[PDB]
Amino acid sequence: LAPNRFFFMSPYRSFTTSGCFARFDEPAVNGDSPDSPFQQKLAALFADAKAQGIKNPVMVGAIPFDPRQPSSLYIPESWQSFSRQEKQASASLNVVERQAIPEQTTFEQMVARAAALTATPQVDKVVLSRLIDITTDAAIDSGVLLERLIAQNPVSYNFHVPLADGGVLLGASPELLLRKDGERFSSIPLAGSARRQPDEVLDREAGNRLLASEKDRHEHELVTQAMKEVLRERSSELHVPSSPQLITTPTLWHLATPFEGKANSQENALTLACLLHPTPALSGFPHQAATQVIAELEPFDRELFGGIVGWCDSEGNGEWVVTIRCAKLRENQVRLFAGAGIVPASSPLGEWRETGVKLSTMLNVFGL
Numbered sequence: 001l002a003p004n005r006f007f008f009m010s011p012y013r014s015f016t017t018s019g020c021f022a023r024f025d026e027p028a029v030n031g032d033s034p035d036s037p038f039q040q041k042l043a044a045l046f047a048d049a050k051a052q053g054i055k056n057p058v059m060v061g062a063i064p065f066d067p068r069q070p071s072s073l074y075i076p077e078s079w080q081s082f083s084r085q086e087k088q089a090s091a092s093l094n095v096v097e098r099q100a101i102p103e104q105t106t107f108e109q110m111v112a113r114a115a116a117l118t119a120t121p122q123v124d125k126v127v128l129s130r131l132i133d134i135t136t137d138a139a140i141d142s143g144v145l146l147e148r149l150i151a152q153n154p155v156s157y158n159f160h161v162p163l164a165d166g167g168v169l170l171g172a173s174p175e176l177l178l179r180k181d182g183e184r185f186s187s188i189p190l191a192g193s194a195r196r197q198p199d200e201v202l203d204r205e206a207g208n209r210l211l212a213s214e215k216d217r218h219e220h221e222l223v224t225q226a227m228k229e230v231l232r233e234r235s236s237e238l239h240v241p242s243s244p245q246l247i248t249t250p251t252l253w254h255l256a257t258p259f260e261g262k263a264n265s266q267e268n269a270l271t272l273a274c275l276l277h278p279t280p281a282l283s284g285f286p287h288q289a290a291t292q293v294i295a296e297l298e299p300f301d302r303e304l305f306g307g308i309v310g311w312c313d314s315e316g317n318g319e320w321v322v323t324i325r326c327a328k329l330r331e332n333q334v335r336l337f338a339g340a341g342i343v344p345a346s347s348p349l350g351e352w353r354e355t356g357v358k359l360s361t362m363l364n365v366f367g368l
């Protein structure tokens, strides 16, 4: 796969893109309102795209964790569908520098300060994050990491996004933020985690301890209760189970609550994805408060990490997944990302190891 190509693998719509008609940097802030400069500029661009010959134009790309920042969206010249089933079956690296940002002690102290703050009224939850920055001696073939990534994660939402800087956004996300498929939309937030065990009894047991974990379930209800409210104002039918179910990835168990709703007349994939994003799985609760902690404590900027990646078409359909279990590569440099939701029951070392298991997915892709 050419690094200049968008790739999206999903049980819903799996396709690749070719070419580039128009890039779209407009920040997705206030993208939930149709009157917003984002939504207006988006319609004018689709219209311009049809006017200039592009059949069924589609918007693909990525939106950062903070949508006041520029977006990484673009309309390709064409797009190509493929079978996810079929793809599920048909699928050196010298190191020069390695650094954790931040390292173990600083991260545990970050969790500890945040878990202290969440014990207070002003904040109930915070998602802290860390990275691993890796330099290599050569240019990275993003096309081959992708084939490795799908093999190791044949079931998740796997994406490969060309970026305006010659880099790629690559990842196997398990969190669907917003699918729109007609007037009906779905959303399956995740929150709470447990390492899978190599034995199927330790595994099943690990999954049960998760469903019984009070810490990991408080971490979860905080997320679903926030979205239940946001979507109550904008839906007509809305089904939210009072409790979560379990799902899996090759490394982790997670807790999931599937959302199902019907959308008003003038919604689209993006108005709704910009509505929910970022959820308390990625920013925290309340949103601004947790965002102030993240800024007070994180010694980097997430940029595209913790954002959303996916696609929206001319007719309102689309899918958007959380930008996690992912990496930004560019020429000879790599940056991985893992965050974790802190609550008063959070263990400083517990979270360090949890963000660690999450990095293991992209590390498994780079054979590290």
Ligand SMILES: C=C(O[C@@H]1C=C(C(=O)O)C=C[C@H]1O)C(=O)O
Pocket: 127, 129, 175, 190, 191, 192, 193, 219, 254, 281, 282, 306, 322, 324, 325, 337, 338, 339, 340, 341, 354, 358
């Ligand atoms: C934001 C991240 O993951 C989130 C963190 C999880 C948790 O431990 O509660 C569950 C859902 C994930 O979407 C990440 O991996 O960086």
Ligand SMILES: [Fe+3]
Pocket: 191, 192, 193, 219, 340, 341, 354
């Ligand atoms: Fe967690």
Ligand SMILES: [Fe+3]
Pocket: 237, 239
């Ligand atoms: Fe119904």
